């Protein structure tokens, strides 16, 4: 283990701390055992407050952070969402499905500002479909709940269904319907960051050495640091 000593604060959503986050805290906390780990799960709102009150060193989220907090914004990863039925519905032998075929099912998803909700809406409004939500939530685990109960189709972030967990659920690709989201790992550019902190946001994301990190600090207009990721493949989930 690292002897390591000191506090590490991150605001988070659910489906980072559901679905991506895990192993990286277990392992993390095995690493550094006198590194006080706090974690803050909630809204995107609570999780932009946290970061702009100086309470959470890093957010991880998708969703956008205070516009007018000076912050650093990495990418981490890209997602896209997916269609999830149960294994009696119509649906389950598809495979696939197009957005005009998914715009006739009853719709259980994800509530407004929440897990990239507006790719949903953009991609109907292209279509000039309008989707029958019947079901909005802030979290996966509701919304499986009630596409397990028959109310509707779910429209979820990849990975928060899968074939351990979600066993009795089918997983239909809505690639091609939908354009990928992408999490970041968001700070202040005035946070002092420390040993443990590169380490974890490397345990999170491998791509985001120190270098890459320090370098992004450095840079200054956020639409140059998104310029130095365009090479740089990120991973997919």
Request: aromatic share 10%; proline share 5%; with cysteine.
């Given at each position: 283990?690292?002897?390591?000593?000191?506090?590490?604060?991150?605001?988070?959503?659910?489906?980072?701390?559901?679905?991506?986050?895990?192993?990286?805290?277990k392992?993390?906390?095995?690493?550094?055992?006198?590194?006080?780990?706090?974690?803050?799960?909630?809204?995107?709102?609570?999780?932009?407050?946290?970061?702009?009150?100086?309470?959470?060193?890093?957010?991880?989220?998708?969703?956008a952070?205070?516009?007018?907090?000076?912050?650093?914004?990495?990418?981490?990863?890209?997602?896209?969402?997916?269609?999830?039925?149960?294994?009696?519905?119509?649906?389950?032998?598809?495979?696939?499905?197009?957005?005009?075929?998914?715009?006739?099912?009853?719709?259980v998803?994800?509530?407004?500002?929440?897990?990239?909700?507006?790719?949903?809406?953009?991609?109907?409004?292209?279509?000039?479909?309008?989707?029958?939500?019947?079901?909005?939530?802030?979290?996966?685990?509701?919304?499986?709940?009630?596409?397990?109960?028959?109310?509707?189709?779910?429209?979820?972030?990849?990975?928060?269904?899968?074939?351990?967990?979600?066993?009795?659920?089918?997983?239909?690709?809505?690639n091609?319907?939908?354009?990928?989201?992408?999490?970041?790992?968001?700070?202040?550019?005035?946070?002092?960051?420390?040993?443990?902190?590169?380490?974890?946001?490397?345990?999170?994301?491998?791509?985001?050495?120190?270098?890459?990190?320090?370098?992004?600090?450095?840079?200054?207009?956020?639409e140059?640091?998104?310029?130095?990721?365009?090479?740089?493949?990120?991973?997919?989930?």
């Amino acid at each position: 283990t690292w002897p390591d000593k000191g506090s590490l604060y991150v605001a988070t959503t659910h489906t980072q701390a559901r679905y991506a986050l895990p192993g990286v805290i277990k392992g993390f906390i095995e690493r550094y055992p006198r590194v006080s780990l706090h974690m803050h799960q909630g809204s995107p709102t609570q999780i932009a407050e946290a970061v702009s009150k100086g309470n959470a060193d890093f957010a991880i989220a998708t969703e956008a952070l205070h516009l007018y907090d000076d912050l650093v914004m990495l990418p981490c990863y890209h997602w896209n969402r997916s269609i999830v039925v149960t294994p009696e519905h119509p649906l389950a032998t598809k495979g696939s499905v197009s957005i005009e075929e998914l715009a006739q099912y009853p719709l259980v998803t994800y509530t407004f500002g929440f897990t990239g909700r507006s790719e949903l809406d953009t991609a109907f409004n292209r279509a000039g479909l309008t989707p029958r939500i019947v079901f909005t939530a802030t979290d996966a685990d509701v919304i499986k709940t009630y596409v397990r109960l028959g109310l509707g189709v779910g429209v979820i972030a990849s990975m928060a269904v899968d074939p351990v967990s979600d066993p009795d659920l089918v997983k239909l690709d809505a690639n091609g319907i939908f354009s990928h989201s992408t999490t970041k790992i968001g700070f202040r550019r005035s946070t002092f960051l420390r040993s443990y902190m590169y380490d974890f946001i490397q345990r999170f994301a491998p791509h985001l050495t120190r270098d890459v990190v320090d370098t992004a600090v450095a840079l200054r207009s956020n639409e140059d640091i998104e310029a130095m990721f365009k090479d740089i493949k990120l991973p997919e989930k």
